[PDB]
Amino acid sequence: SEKAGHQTSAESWGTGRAVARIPRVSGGGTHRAGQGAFGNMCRSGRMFAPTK
Amino acid sequence: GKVKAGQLWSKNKEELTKILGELKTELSQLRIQKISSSGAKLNKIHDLRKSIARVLTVINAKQRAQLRLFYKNKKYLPLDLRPKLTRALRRRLSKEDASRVLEKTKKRLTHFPQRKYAVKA
Amino acid sequence: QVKVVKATGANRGIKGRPKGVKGRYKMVDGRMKKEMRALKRLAKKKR
Amino acid sequence: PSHKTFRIKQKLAKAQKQNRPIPQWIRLRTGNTIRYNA
Amino acid sequence: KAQIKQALKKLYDIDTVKINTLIRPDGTKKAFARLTPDVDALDIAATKLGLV
Amino acid sequence: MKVRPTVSSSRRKARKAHFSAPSSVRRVIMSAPLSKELREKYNVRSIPIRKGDEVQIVRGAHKDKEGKVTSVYRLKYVIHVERVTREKATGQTVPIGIHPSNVVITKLHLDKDRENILARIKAGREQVAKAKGK
Amino acid sequence: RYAATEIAPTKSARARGSYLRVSFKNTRETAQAINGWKLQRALTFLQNVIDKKEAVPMRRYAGSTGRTAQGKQWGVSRARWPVKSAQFLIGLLKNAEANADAKGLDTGNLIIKHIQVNQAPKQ
Amino acid sequence: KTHGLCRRCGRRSLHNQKKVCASCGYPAAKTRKYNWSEKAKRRKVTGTGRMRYLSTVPRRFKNGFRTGVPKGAR
RNA sequence: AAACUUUCAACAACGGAUCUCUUGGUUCUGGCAUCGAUGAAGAACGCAGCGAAAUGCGAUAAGUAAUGUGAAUUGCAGAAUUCCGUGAAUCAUCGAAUCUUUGAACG
RNA sequence: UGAGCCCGGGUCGAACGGCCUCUAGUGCAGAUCUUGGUGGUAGUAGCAAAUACUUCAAUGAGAACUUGAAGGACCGAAGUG
RNA sequence: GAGACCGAUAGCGCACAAGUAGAGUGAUCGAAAGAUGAAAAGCACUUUGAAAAGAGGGUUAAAUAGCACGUGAAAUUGUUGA
Ligand SMILES: [Zn+2]
């Protein structure tokens, strides 16, 4: 599905934080909050070159 | 404590009302005496509740049949008795109005209607 | 003016503004040390 | 507070009704996967 | 209160001096019916209510 | 091989239908075969099982043992045969769930409805046999 | 199942406790303290530990433990009194002694052949 | 607090000053909806509720919106 | 020598990887066209003998009428069904109804 | 040679493999990688101030912080009401 | 109705009482979580324990399957052996 991996709101925390420069889900009251997204190496993320 | 639908259909309005009143009185009394030692009395209460529903359904159905017979030959019927269908289907043109066509088109079709024919191989 | 904050201790892996009450802050890392060295070597090559 | 409405009182009663535990016979039904209240 | 008094009168033949109503925390109504001095509450409860 | 487009060879859909079938479909599924004597008596191969039938268990740990059906427990696709039980720890006997495909019917509970079912099955079988023969 | 599977079950007594809310490190230290002893000696020692008459040596998990003359019984300086672990081991040892009584073994000649403390799922 | 309960959508999102629901816009006849929030659209789209009557329509269509009683029924 | 640190093995722990499965998802194809003032979509509160959620229903409330099938439901408890019958069922179909407060919501 | 392949012993319970072609979401130590789990640090840092507690008896398997009585302290009507 | 698709960190966020629990004043954000066994046959009875549980005993082909349940790796840990 073309919407797979993109049905989330994530933004990179920044550069100077001692964490990987990866988009992270906003929020703050669930396990999903703060986790990486939008990447091929991230769990529950998009696959590399999605099949068409 | 079970009331039969066939017997209810056979019976008329006054007997139906009498049975409904008896069932309601029995249900009230047996609920009052049920609140202590609610058992097979609970089973009986479930039975009378279903029986009251059945009697009410029979009374309502007979009344609606009578009303439909009364409004059989009248232009406007109650909205409850008018067919539901769909809002669009109700708004839709009637069959007569949809099939009604102009007189000139009628004449053209009368005197030149699609013919039956075949072409030899 | 702009205060520089090391992302270590209580400041490591935090979402936003740390406890430092100031107008403007800047988080730093060793990853940024290497970025900074790359920027200066490019600048010196250009000059 | 002490001043409220019967509707909000009924809503609080319903909230408690959800905040009751689960029945053992529900647990013992065949094909059941319910273990505890969530 | 009028409906409760009428119901106790017509169904169970109970004359009540007064009725006090409250709504319980669960949402049902509770009615205290104080009866006439002529009738006996114990006798009525034993006869028509099936309560000891 | 399937031909009609309405039927599906989908394992997923077939298992979903089998495990979510209503009680009447479960009855049809839990149809069971008849004995040989009943076979040449009624010209019927199989019939849905019911509570009053006498059956012979011929598959499972219970080798060749007979008994009256006690209950057709349609929820988990099993039937209960009289005297085919196992003792719990407490010593109370609980019936063993047996399958209609594993049982065979020896004596059949008779009424108007099942006589009609037998007549319909026999009529179809004899009509097709006559059509094939001549 | 038990770790020591080389012991025939008809000639020995056993006891088990699982998901016990007591410190794993202290329980291991006191189990090593009572390991290989006779049952009465172990029971008296555990009661003395509860009463702070004797202390168990802390061998491996012994960070910053005060020194006590009681440790001289073990040739060590770091000794401590794990009261809770002592009570738990007393409970299991009494259960094992009761199992031995049921089996008919002689209680005066029993030794703690095997004792093991493992980590339970964390809470 | 700036948000009490809204009677139309049931969320604690009606402003107490503006008297407008921030979720559905209750005083307006239309239900608030924007195409940049597919998640909100699919949170409050048809099928997320009870389906009182739209769930009963298809069977009447299948039988053809036919009215009456079976012949010979009591 | 023991203890302690470390190496290997056996067994036992922690943890849930691997293998196997799948009433689920994803993609494609085919037939058909059907919401609402005759009150929709959505929200709320009630209803089961013993139910909180899910599901169903609306004071006729885990449902009524009708048609078909033909002997159940099931966790327990209590009743059935005479079985040579207008008839069990958390059955199916479904043309008749009941359908609380709101919500386009309309004293 | 090697990436690897094959067998034995133990565990386990329902499917799997060789060969020739086809096809690909096909091979990891790193990416301050993602998710989850687990260590050393470590039984370590630490568990504050509101002056204060004590004796007997009772319940209980178990009593410093559960109770009764007795003492010794405190809020001091702008109260610890 | 189908597939040279995916097979529980995959495939829709959701194979489960998932747009649920939860977070935010709000617009909104939004998870984790499948598998005993053919059949519960889900351990009667005895004993220790305050109890939780343990040990005998029993069901099962198997408890080296006990509803912390198919198989059960590594990291890490305990005991024993060298
Ligand atoms: Zn609203």
mmCIF file of N, CA and C in Angstrom, chain B residues 2 10 21 23 67 78 85 90 105:
data_model
loop_
_atom_site.group_PDB
_atom_site.id
_atom_site.type_symbol
_atom_site.label_atom_id
_atom_site.label_comp_id
_atom_site.label_asym_id
_atom_site.label_seq_id
_atom_site.Cartn_x
_atom_site.Cartn_y
_atom_site.Cartn_z
ATOM 1 N N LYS B 2 -46.786 -19.325 28.432
ATOM 2 C CA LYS B 2 -46.519 -19.080 27.022
ATOM 3 C C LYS B 2 -47.833 -18.842 26.293
ATOM 4 N N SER B 10 -56.304 -15.792 16.033
ATOM 5 C CA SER B 10 -57.716 -16.161 16.046
ATOM 6 C C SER B 10 -58.544 -15.198 16.889
ATOM 7 N N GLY B 21 -54.118 -7.366 29.781
ATOM 8 C CA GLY B 21 -54.276 -6.914 31.153
ATOM 9 C C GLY B 21 -53.962 -7.997 32.166
ATOM 10 N N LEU B 23 -51.949 -10.580 31.757
ATOM 11 C CA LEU B 23 -50.506 -10.796 31.752
ATOM 12 C C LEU B 23 -49.776 -9.690 32.498
ATOM 13 N N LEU B 67 -56.716 -0.402 9.433
ATOM 14 C CA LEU B 67 -56.485 0.930 8.879
ATOM 15 C C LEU B 67 -56.190 0.875 7.385
ATOM 16 N N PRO B 78 -51.817 7.436 5.845
ATOM 17 C CA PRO B 78 -50.870 7.831 6.891
ATOM 18 C C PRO B 78 -49.439 7.490 6.504
ATOM 19 N N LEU B 85 -39.403 2.326 1.008
ATOM 20 C CA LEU B 85 -38.487 2.294 -0.141
ATOM 21 C C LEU B 85 -37.245 3.106 0.223
ATOM 22 N N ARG B 90 -38.728 7.338 -3.645
ATOM 23 C CA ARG B 90 -39.985 8.039 -3.418
ATOM 24 C C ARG B 90 -40.055 9.346 -4.195
ATOM 25 N N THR B 105 -44.380 11.669 -31.157
ATOM 26 C CA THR B 105 -43.531 10.491 -31.041
ATOM 27 C C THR B 105 -44.366 9.216 -31.050
#
